[model samples]
Target: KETAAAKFERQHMDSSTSAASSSNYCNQMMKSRNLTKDRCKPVNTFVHESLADVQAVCSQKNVACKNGQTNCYQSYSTMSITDCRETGSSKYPNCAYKTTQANKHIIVACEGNPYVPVHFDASV
Candidate 1:
């Protein structure tokens, strides 16, 4: 079975073919919907779902939550959350949440060009 992180990466992260452009597949989807300005904001990918459900998933994976709490597991290499935030454009805001569990990375999503997942190491 695939790990939560693996599943997330596979489902959310773009392949080399999809990464050639400034916007990733998700960003492109937002753009197509006319949400061109704040490209990094969390677009409702799963319709008819509540924010609570999204939070649950992030928490279960030991990932960061959307409530701005520090995550325990930091990304390795370029997956660092700090770097991701720094590199992102201002138009796209970085929204984060903290899961119920400890020792996990935060779940971060951005709204901007070159849009993709932002990996952050738990600072606390």
Candidate 2:
């Protein structure tokens, strides 16, 4: 079974992707990275930063979760990230995504005995 930390990395971490990548970056990544295989991931976020920098977000102050859960935290500084949203007409085995990159403070939901990010909540 994949750990929370590993799952977060699989779903959201893309440190090697250039922050200035082309528009199709997400489209290609979502498939090549195997995120679109089973089903189209409705929306996904990728963080373009070092693993250490991302992990540090867990140490940030508590922030409100969209669901009103208290297990979320927000980054103090803006970070490089890309959000991928699926097109309404996208069908299985043919995922289409619109990529948008921005510099924004991110919000993540954390969980684990040692406390690590498990989900990419949002970017503020």
Candidate 3:
């Protein structure tokens, strides 16, 4: 079974590609990452950083999550990220996305003893 930490990495981490230059990035990645199944996620974020770097955010100042949980934390440095949002005409099984790339501080929810990100909460 996929743990929450593994799921978060699958959904968000994209350390190698410079997806900002590609118009079809989200359309391709969403499918390849298996995020197009069941339902099209309304919005998703892909962090262009190494797993170790992102995981280190757990040691930063703790913050509140969007759902009001207190286990969230913000990245110490701004990172390149791409936000994929479902286009207005997108429908399930035909999930289309628009990609927007930016450099921002990431926020995530973390758990477990080793401490890793479990949810991508937001970017600022």
Best by lDDT: 3
* Backbone clash numbers for all candidates listed: 21, 0, 0
Ordered from best to worst TM-score, the candidate numbers read 3, 2, 1
Report every candidate's CA lDDT: 0.32, 0.88, 0.92
- Taking the tens digit of each residue's C-alpha lDDT, what string does model 2 give over 23-108? 78878989977899899988898999998888889899798899999989999989999989999888988999989999999999
Per-residue alpha-carbon lDDT of model 3 for 29-122, expressed as tens digits? 8988999888898889999988989999999968899999899999889989999999999988999999999999999999998889999999
In TM-score terms, candidate 1 sits at 0.24
The number of residue pairs in model 1 that clash at the backbone is 21
Identify the candidate with maximal TM-score: 3
Give, for candidate 2, the lowest lDDT window spanning 10 residues: 17-26
TM-score, candidate number 2: 0.92
User: Model 1, 7-92: lDDT tens per residue?
Assistant: 34433332233122322434443444333344444332211122333233333334444556544232222221111121233354
**Worst 10 contiguous positions by lDDT, candidate 1:** 77-86
Residue 87, model 3, lDDT: 96
Superior by lDDT: candidate 1 or candidate 3: 3
